[model samples]
Target: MIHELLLALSGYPGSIFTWNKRSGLQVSQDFPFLHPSETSVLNRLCRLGTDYIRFTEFIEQYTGHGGLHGIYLRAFCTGLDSVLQPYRQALLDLEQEFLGDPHLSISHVNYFLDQFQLLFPSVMVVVEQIKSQKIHGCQILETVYKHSCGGLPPVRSALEKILAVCHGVMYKQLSAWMLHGLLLDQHEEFFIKQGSLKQFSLRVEILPSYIPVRVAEKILFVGESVQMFENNVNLTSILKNQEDTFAAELHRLKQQPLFSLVDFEQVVDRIRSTVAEHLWKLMVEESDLLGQLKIIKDFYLLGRGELFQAFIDTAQHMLKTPPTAVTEHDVNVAFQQSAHKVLLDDDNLLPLLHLTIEYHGASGWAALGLSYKVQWPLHILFTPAVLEKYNVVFKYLLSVRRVQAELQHCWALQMQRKHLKSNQTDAIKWRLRNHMAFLVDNLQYYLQVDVLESQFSQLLHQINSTRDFESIRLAHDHFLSNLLAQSFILLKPVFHCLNEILDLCHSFCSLVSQNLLDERGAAQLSILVKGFSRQSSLLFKILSSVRNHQINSDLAQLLLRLDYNKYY
Candidate 1:
């Protein structure tokens, strides 16, 4: 095949070209060719009037390209879905296409193979292909990146990939990678969910360092804003505080995937009601922290459709078996998994434990006002979890597993390299050790009593300390940057969705304590409880992912084993 391809190409050896005639990109050298076809294919796709020899010239000529991606999405994807309506028709169509008529395309075949082929070429594509079957409602825009528009990649943050899928899968994938890079190679992530058609508009945002177009062409419709994220203080501030500022800044995230007066609470509740109670009881009753963790070996034995059920079954088995089987002492241990921020570092709990309580308390007040109130016992139970989370485990939980994994990965690689021979060894062996030390320093940053007090400061400090190794660590020991650490799966706390709703209920009680519950107050409390259930369930998703992408790491797990914080 290569011989055949080479024979046809030898005459031309690929003509000198750029997408935009004047500015986009140019391939001057045969070596270090970064996707050569990027220029030609894009020129045709953009339908620009002319072509260019270089990326800069293409941009200089065909300026409309900045918004190409937005245009693509607006024409195809329906945006993210808040309700099942977006996916219903797709699901039905998929069902009918396969079951009703064998002649028609199978959902997997038409989508995974055919559609996937059109969007991306085989050479540049990686992993199991994904296809979108859902029409999520409205699409605000579509987008495409020509080249490095700025110092960063055309796609600055991984979160924006959500735009491509028209919803949150990209965000989920990115988060999964951040926790465990291996998830980047997983398959279930490629599953398609059907969506409903909805109305929306389109907009495009461009960055710097863009590769240009070949000719000076009049491209498709395009628009721009001078700045986004940080440069625009108003937009940046709105997005950073997503809970409070999303109303205004969401457009920056994308104009599509949003609905007018849509109730996110109702949509998420369906998932919660599906298995919320089953998870709450099973996980708590089955913790084996004092013993070993016993995971069910059979994925088939537990054929749960929902991740919550699958995890519960695994938790139950662990509680029942040895290595992970719990003694009487470990009975209450399982109830401790939650995700919240703990403000204090003296103890060893994830910050999410504390943040969960704080968030619920705030949500309750915001939703119910004086009508809703909390009960005494409920307060007594949750308050300690909150304090232990903040005052004890606060800062220690975040990177506990991350640090330990780094240590192990480094130690393994270093000892292995020492045996590799002097000539074969690279300075990176020593640098890996240095990087390990740097990570340890990062660990120490949060361990301080002061560092645990402020979430904002802790994040800032961690950001300031981050540095990339020139040659990345891929060793088994050093590659500990994943979500799965023993502490995270076992000791890492996860809050109950019902408990959050109940917490709001308790708050509602407090609001009515002074007087009999009034109509307005009761109505408000109900709404608050409803919202709490929805949001708490959404947070649970993060917890579930945190466990699923876990690798054999130590950061979170080792800290728990060290017994550094007795109360924790």
Candidate 2:
């Protein structure tokens, strides 16, 4: 009976203690006359054997050669092996003792099972949790860490050891990303993923539940920044020293018995700030971020009035021509001529600035666009989408500037004309011209003074005060969106209405330039005046309604400027 009990406890079938599918190892009917106390001892030891059987089965199933398991699952099985070492050793020693004694008692076997009474249950608790839940990757670590929270000393210690191994695996992946910005994960187990756009993004579902979302975002930023820096071989040479410092820090973190989320977050923040500061220097001081901003402002926002004025004059003939009549090279030559006239001496930026013409059934002026060749690192901030928005604002501003110039030319034409007392049509034409001029001038004021200048100054202040690249990027984004919204570009109806009014003004100016003050011209002016009044009133109503809802308070400023005399 002692020999059979030893064999059964060692996870094998025996004649006296037979394996039962329903009740696991059980005493055979042949041994029914055994004493109750002895049977109870065998039954207690049988439960330990049952757990051992299930645990071994789980290890075999997960670690088998199906090749379907993930890296984290394999790592977990390896941890289980380490946890089972002492138990296996103890069983081997007991079997050796039995080999030395021909008559080893069941009471001695019971004593052997008592040594593992607490340990086997604890280990099985973890194994069952993993098996039943079927969780993989960092989820296994989270499960073990949760179980380690409240348990017996032996149980907690066993779980802690397993956790140490799993954390080592996790930290290996983290170190690859943090130290060198490499995604070494083979099974997509890591939290950060490379997106379809060739950008790095966080997989919230894959991120360990222990990490805060905010901390995960910072980690994402650090890795992405390092990856972008690597694209420029010259910039990577500057970060070689930092790579070692971060690696050493990660190694120190990995050595802790229990992973400290707070310490881990602190280390991520440190890496984030350091990488951000370096990117800031590379952008602001090295690659001339502020200077690039200046170019965008002066050219795109039409801040350089004299420069664009010269450009408009030089490109005047081509702009007046049909879209199909104008070529890209011709416009670029005129742009260069104007640049020379304005003495624009940006040797580095000049080559990057060029003219693009896209004809979408529009005139030459409408098709004209200015483009800048954004370089690496700087391109992170000035993305293609962002530059497209700039082009939209540029087109709007150029249209307004051109209308304003045409109105001013009308004023010159009025000054050169000889007035006749019999000409009441000329008086009406002059009054209409004054109204058009007032609307255009004030609209320009609202854009340049209220929206562009105010927002640009605020953006500059933010960029200067902070050395952090993220903050600067955010500020620039805010600046651009505000410009688009406040200038009414984003307000589609208001934008189109304003464009129609400008078109009306342009049409009236063209009539005046043709020296047309005949009866037919008087009738044309009347129709234009009616259309202008209707469109302008619609614009005022829209602005008033938008302001009442408090959608955009900036529109109120333009409202006050437009209707200062209650003339709307």
Candidate 3:
């Protein structure tokens, strides 16, 4: 088709061809490609017949010695019929007549040829210099092509004239068959290369279906894909991997076991340490790390170990340091210092204590308020009753301290009586011993009440009833146990640490004869009473001693035997 078209237009004069801005030529309006030379040289070849022009046009149309034109020409010339053979003589005849035409004489053609020859050497040198500089793209070559033959206008005009007719034929043929786009598109990948960024370097993949289109529409194309291609390669896959990794990290984090109460601070540090590397490798922005960190931090804080320690410390300080006040708020603030979500109906009980009793009610389930004070509501309300139990236990401790004081006072009186020498009769001394024995014997009963109530079995009842009660029970038991153990040790020497002495005193008192008392027995009773008086007081003196332990010498000796220290 292209050969036929070229042949049909073979006799058309170059002067008949005219440039059209929208299309290649007025003659080839429906052509797909932009003619490279038609606009520049047709007017210069005004007298040349199409036969002579067609041959030159066909020769250079797709054929350059070594250039982009050469590359495209060879690609188009393939598998096409030969129009050159039939038109060969016609073109020869046309050139033979070219020197005869007044407008195109042989002298004029030869003069133009001579001028071109003279200009050609310097042009090649300048072009090679431009090529050596390796200026990017074809712009520099195009500028040189435009201005290189400036002084030799006639020569420039004639050479441009030949090029126009030739390239015009090639352009028209390629456009008419849609072969310009076809050929380039077939071997779309020509060179491993790049051009300017999209803004400047976009070239057409195919000619426009319609005229008057964008500059982008007139050419076939290759080579202007990316700015940062290497770094950007497979980047979306990396993001996808990052998202999946983050999801796995998030899932693992949620499944982790709770931080231990014993070493929560270290657990938090470990969480941070592990999360840092996982989050960094997760690589994606926005989702998993922060949420998981918050989860773990909340879990770690929920242990409330420090808060519990603070509350216990404040409670101890209040109990030991007189004139100190303690309240639920002190414990409440300690909980606030730690992070937790424990809730209670009264709000006041949440931090200091939160208790629930599972006892049945009329409605099958009902919770009553449990606090420091005891309130026994009507019904089998377990929470309220347990609170009452706490109140009872509290009363027991308070009473236990008073009873301890009373016992200490008794021991003191006994010490005073023992220090005094025997003043009156043996019966009077027997009365003193009998009274002291009774005091010591009953003091044991009072002190043992709190101790008996504070055993593990009683605490186990609290533990079953309510959680808060369990905690309170443990501390309460510790307090009672310490007080009892130390109190027994304090009273140990005063009472000779035996009930047999009391029995001995009782027997002595009963056997005393009122009338005709045995004198020998009285003297013996006097000696026995004096010895008991001094010895009984000696225990108190040892209790108040500065050098050794104040509780009991025997207790200290026992403690030494065990290699013990700081019992209280």
Candidate 4:
């Protein structure tokens, strides 16, 4: 019985104390009877045998050939084997003692059991800690951490050793990503996953609970920027020069105590800022990010008044025709001619600017758009989705400029008739024209000054204040969305009201330009004048209601400007 118990305690099945599927380490019915005291000792030893079998089987299954566990789990298994070494040696020592003394008794076995009574239960505690659920890389660390919070000293020390091994695996993965932008996770165990087309994203599930999501995002950005830098042959050499510094920084982080969340976050932030500043320098100095932003402002947002004015003058004739009659080449030629007349400092960027024409039934101005070709690295900041938003704002601003020009031409025609006109009908037409001009001029001022200039200055201030690329990207996005909303371009109902008024002005100007202000034309002009007054009043009311709602207080600036003299 003593020999059988020793073999069973060492995880080997014996005939007198054979393994059972349900009961485990059961006493066979054919065995000889024993004293109750012996039975109690055997029963106590059997419990230890059960835990040994369970723990050894678990280790074998996870660490054996063809095991599907990740690197972190395998590291954990290796650490567990080392922790069990002392217990295995003690058991072997007892076996040798039994071989030497031919009279080994239950008392000797009991003393052996008492030596490791606390050790086996503690090991079993850790075994049961990870056995409750399916766990992966960082999740394994989190589970061990949670269990270590309230366990015996032996269990706590054992779990900490496991944590050390697992964290070592994590450190290697993190260093590879942060230093070289290399994702070395073969089993998808790292928190950052490779996305399609050179894009990388964070996997929240794989991330340890100790790190916050925001910090993880910064970490993701650093790796992604390094990858982008590596894509450029010229930039790769620069990155290679900085590799040693990055590696040293990672080394400092590795030397810190394990599971120190504050230390981890601070280190991640330091690395993030370093990576971001490098990318920012590359963008500002090498790729000319500020120059690109200036181009967007001047061309896309129509901030360059003289350039767009010249463009309108050159393209006015073709712009009056239907889209089917106009081609992109014709409009692009007009654009180049205007750029020549205005004389841009850098014509190299001019080739990237082209006029896109959509074949709708509307006039050329309605279908025309300006498209800027964004190159490599810059495309990361100026994505296609962002450019589409810029196009929307461009279309809105261009429509306003067109209406303003039409109204100005009508004013010129009215001046030409001033020398000979002297009647109430003429007086009414001139008064209506003056009111229309006032509204259009004030609307343009409100947009260019209150919305575009102010918001753009704020955006520049934000960009100048931050060296982080992500912050700059966020600031640019805020600038664009604010421009769209405050300029009333995003408000569908408000835009329709404004468009109706502009269309009325355009039609009224066309009538006056064609010398059609006769008695029959007077009736048409009266209807247009009423429609203009009605639409303008509706727009004013909408702005007032919108301002009252406090959704966008910036709209109040336009309202105050429009009603400066209480004209509305």
What TM-score would every model get versus the actual structure? 0.16, 0.80, 0.21, 0.80
Clashes of 1: 102
lDDT of 4 at 416: 62
What digit string (tens of lDDT, one per residue) describes model 4 on residues 42-139? 87888878877887777787786432478877877877877777778878988998899968887787886674677667766656656656577778
* Candidate 4: residue 395 lDDT (0-100): 82
Per-residue lDDT value at 337 in model 3:
41
For 511-537, candidate 1 gives per-residue lDDT tens digits of 433344367765765675456546444
RMSD of each: 32.3, 5.5, 31.7, 5.6
Best candidate (score: lDDT): 2
The sequence of per-residue lDDT tens digits that candidate 3 reaches over residues 164-248 is 3323333333332221122222322221112311222332322221212232222211111112112223332112344344334
Q: Which candidate, 2 or 3, would have the higher lDDT against the true structure?
A: 2
- TM for candidate 2 is 0.80
Model 2, 1-568: lDDT tens digits are 7677667767787776777888777774345667778778878888888777776777777776423357677777777778877777878887898889978877787886685767888778777777777776777877888888757887888888888888888889887776667888777777888872258888888777888889999988887776665342553333558778888888898888888889998998998889888878888888889888988998889898887888887787887766664467898888888888888887666688888888654568878888988887688899888998888888877876775676566544554555323356457567766766676555555556656787798998999899999999999999888767654532444555666776776676566556554798778878988988987666665544443434444445445655564684
Where does candidate 4 stray beyond 4 Å? 29-33, 64-68, 113-116, 121-132, 231-233, 236-258, 312-326, 357-368, 409-442, 489-568
* lDDT of candidates 1 onward, in order: 0.28, 0.75, 0.35, 0.74
Query: Lowest lDDT 10-mer window, candidate 1?
Result: 217-226
